Design a protein around this nucleic acid. Structure first.
Ligand SMILES: Nc1nc2c([nH]c(=O)n2[C@H]2C[C@H](O)[C@@H](COP(=O)(O)OP(=O)(O)OP(=O)(O)O)O2)c(=O)[nH]1
Ligand SMILES: [Cl-]
Ligand SMILES: [Cl-]
Ligand SMILES: [Cl-]
Ligand SMILES: [Mg+2]
Ligand code: NA
Ligand code: NA
Ligand code: NA
Length: 326
DNA sequence: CCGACAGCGCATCAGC
DNA sequence: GCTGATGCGC
DNA sequence: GTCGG
């Protein structure tokens, strides 16, 4: 947390560009700068120093100097006072409400938690659940709770079919002491890139988890991706645990490594790695790593037997999950 | 100084 | 109904 | 907003 003041400033700016300006490349730019500054092992003394880092340019360097000199950023002080920008930023905190829906709601006079609550019929399903658990989804998940959640999921999955393999990824796999949610990667021998010999593979599991009351709500559900809500059971006379976001992704068993790499992240780590792959003449997604033809057309999937193989293709030394938190 | 910026599942919509 | 674009959350 | 060619 050497440069927490600066990284928070950049994150707020990033959020403004994404939610209010609807400028996603500026959003990513600010996040990249925040990320590289966050891992910089020195307490930054000037914009010039920061500008030496990849991702920090002239503009951000100037902002860093203002921040260092005054402890504030006028551009942000103004934004904080703009009611429309403030309303839009708030509404986007509800899962399901993005930049477009937020502005739309503001236009229609809906701009507070109270307004949302009285206008549920104006929200789609995902948004309705996001509002319902607004407060809970704001809370972090202690690793101790992630362990109990892992136990339940793996044991219930085993009960459905012992051939299932569920792996908890995301920040948990990176060893974080707290997570924003739970990310489960799921595989089954019947589902491969070659064939889908058994249907309802994801459904069955989701069903079992709901049966035992672990999964409480569903945001979206398809053949391979489930996004919903879950909750740990509490003891007698015990206050209930907060509801949590859970994502379950069923990936072809032979594509497990590309899958676990993607689901482990971080998000910024994935973007940096996928961008580097391109510069190296490859393209990476959660399923495969393919070379780029002389015309920029993806070729056939390359053989992969470990996450390291992916790193080797793009000439990157291997990095354990714990070192991918960018 | 301009084009590129990672890549994709599900929900929702418009147009036919 | 299907296709394809858009919004959204990764 | 930043960076490479
Ligand atoms: N948040 C996010 N995750 C992404 C993106 N693209 C992408 O491949 N991912 C991957 C890397 C993440 O580790 C993984 C799971 O998403 P996540 O939001 O749960 O991220 P996380 O587990 O690292 O962090 P968290 O839950 O503790 O907030 O999805 C993206 O744009 N945003
Ligand atoms: Cl942009
Ligand atoms: Cl500020
Ligand atoms: Cl693919
Ligand atoms: Mg997560
Ligand atoms: Na720089
Ligand atoms: Na949102
Ligand atoms: Na997640």
């Amino acid at each position: 947390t050497l440069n927490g003041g600066i990284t928070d400033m950049l994150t707020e700016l990033a959020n403004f560009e994404k939610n209010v300006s609807q400028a996603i490349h500026k959003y990513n730019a600010y996040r990249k700068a925040a990320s590289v500054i966050a891992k910089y092992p020195h307490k930054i003394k000037s914009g010039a120093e920061a500008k030496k880092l990849p991702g920090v340019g002239t503009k951000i360097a100037e902002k860093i100097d203002e921040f260092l000199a005054t402890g504030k950023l006028r551009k942000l002080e103004k934004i904080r006072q703009d009611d429309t920008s403030s309303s839009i930023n708030f509404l986007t905190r509800v899962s399901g409400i993005g930049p477009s829906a937020a502005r739309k709601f503001v236009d229609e006079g809906i701009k507070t938690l109270e307004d949302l609550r009285k206008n549920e019929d104006k929200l789609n399903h995902h948004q309705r659940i996001g509002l319902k658990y607004f407060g809970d989804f704001e809370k972090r998940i202690p690793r101790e709770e992630m362990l109990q959640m892992q136990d339940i999921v793996l044991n219930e999955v085993k009960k459905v079919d012992s051939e299932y393999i569920a792996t908890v990824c995301g920040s948990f796999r990176r060893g974080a002491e707290s997570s924003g949610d739970m990310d489960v990667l799921l595989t089954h021998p019947s589902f491969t890139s070659e064939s889908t010999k058994q249907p309802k593979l994801l459904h069955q599991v989701v069903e079992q988890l709901q049966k035992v009351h672990f999964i409480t709500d569903t945001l979206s559900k398809g053949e391979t991706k489930f996004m919903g809500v879950c909750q740990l059971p509490s003891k007698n006379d015990e206050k209930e645990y907060p509801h949590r976001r859970i994502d379950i992704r069923l990936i072809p068993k032979d594509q497990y490594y590309c899958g676990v790499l993607y689901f482990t992240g971080s998000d910024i780590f994935n973007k940096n790695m996928r961008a580097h792959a391109l510069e190296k003449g490859f393209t990476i997604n959660e399923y495969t790593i393919r070379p780029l033809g002389v015309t920029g057309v993806a070729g056939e999937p390359l053989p992969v037997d470990s996450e390291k193989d992916i790193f080797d293709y793009i000439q990157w030394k291997y990095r354990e999950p714990k070192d991918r938190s960018e």
